[PDB]
Design an enzyme around this catalytic site. Structure first.
Site, PDB file in Angstrom:
ATOM      1  N   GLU A  75       0.867  -1.189   0.000  1.00 16.73           N
ATOM      2  CA  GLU A  75       0.000   0.000   0.000  1.00 16.73           C
ATOM      3  C   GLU A  75       0.889   1.219   0.000  1.00 16.73           C
ATOM      4  O   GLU A  75       0.473   2.240  -0.442  1.00 16.73           O
ATOM      5  CB  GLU A  75      -0.912   0.006   1.202  1.00 16.73           C
ATOM      6  CG  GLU A  75      -2.063  -0.962   1.110  1.00 16.73           C
ATOM      7  CD  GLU A  75      -2.919  -0.772  -0.133  1.00 16.73           C
ATOM      8  OE1 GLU A  75      -2.768   0.247  -0.915  1.00 16.73           O
ATOM      9  OE2 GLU A  75      -3.756  -1.655  -0.399  1.00 16.73           O
ATOM     10  N   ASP A  95      -5.172   6.770  -5.343  1.00 18.83           N
ATOM     11  CA  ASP A  95      -4.770   5.366  -5.387  1.00 18.83           C
ATOM     12  C   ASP A  95      -4.807   4.865  -6.843  1.00 18.83           C
ATOM     13  O   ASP A  95      -5.026   5.647  -7.763  1.00 18.83           O
ATOM     14  CB  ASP A  95      -5.670   4.476  -4.490  1.00 18.83           C
ATOM     15  CG  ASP A  95      -7.118   4.313  -5.016  1.00 18.83           C
ATOM     16  OD1 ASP A  95      -7.494   4.746  -6.106  1.00 18.83           O
ATOM     17  OD2 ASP A  95      -7.960   3.721  -4.275  1.00 18.83           O
TER      18      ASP A  95
END
Ligand SMILES: CCCc1ccccc1O
Length: 163
Positions: free
Chosen positions: A11, A20
């Site tokens: 992540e 993202d």
């Protein structure tokens, strides 16, 4: 290796609001703030999440706090889900980390649907499960990450992260 270290590799850590892989406003360790294209709507969600006026920036500690909550929630979500819990409970702890990672990234809607992969994992047909998992928008959109999580499911080892 453990689920935090795993998800932290997958992540990243960013302290300022970023988009993202899907273009959605996110902060910290893959903490999704919103799907809204409105940066302000993300900033409002951030401030709600943190309990202070962050002006789109947080600390490492605040990131790890959200992350703690996010991991915890991912597990608790799996355990609440009739489709997921029996499969997850059938897994050893390394493959359970793979499952948590998948739910963290994709959400529990996102995967409760993966019926054939779930059956294969429950059956412990690891190579077959691994082939089925890769047949997905998931894999094609984030292949490097999906390859690591699939390898974790296939082997129940940390070989894809060790590294
Ligand atoms: C293809 C589903 C893999 C999985 C198994 C169990 C719980 C969550 C999961 O994402």
């Amino acid at each position: 290796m453990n689920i935090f270290e795993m998800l932290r590799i997958d992540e990243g850590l960013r302290l300022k609001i970023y988009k993202d892989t899907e273009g959605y406003y996110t902060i910290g360790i893959g903490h999704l703030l919103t799907k809204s294209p409105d940066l302000n709507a993300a900033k409002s969600e951030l401030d709600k999440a943190i309990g202070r006026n962050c002006n789109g920036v947080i600390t490492k500690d605040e990131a790890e706090k959200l992350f703690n909550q996010d991991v915890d929630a991912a597990v608790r979500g799996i355990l609440r889900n009739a489709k997921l819990k029996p499969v997850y409970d059938s897994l050893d702890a390394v493959r359970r980390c793979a499952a948590i990672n998948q739910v963290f990234q994709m959400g529990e809607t996102g995967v409760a649907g993966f019926t054939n992969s779930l059956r294969m994992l429950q059956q412990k047909r690891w190579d077959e499960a691994a082939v089925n998992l890769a047949k997905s928008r998931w894999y094609n959109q984030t292949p490097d990450r999906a390859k690591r999580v699939i390898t974790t499911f296939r082997t129940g080892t940390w070989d894809a992260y060790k590294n």
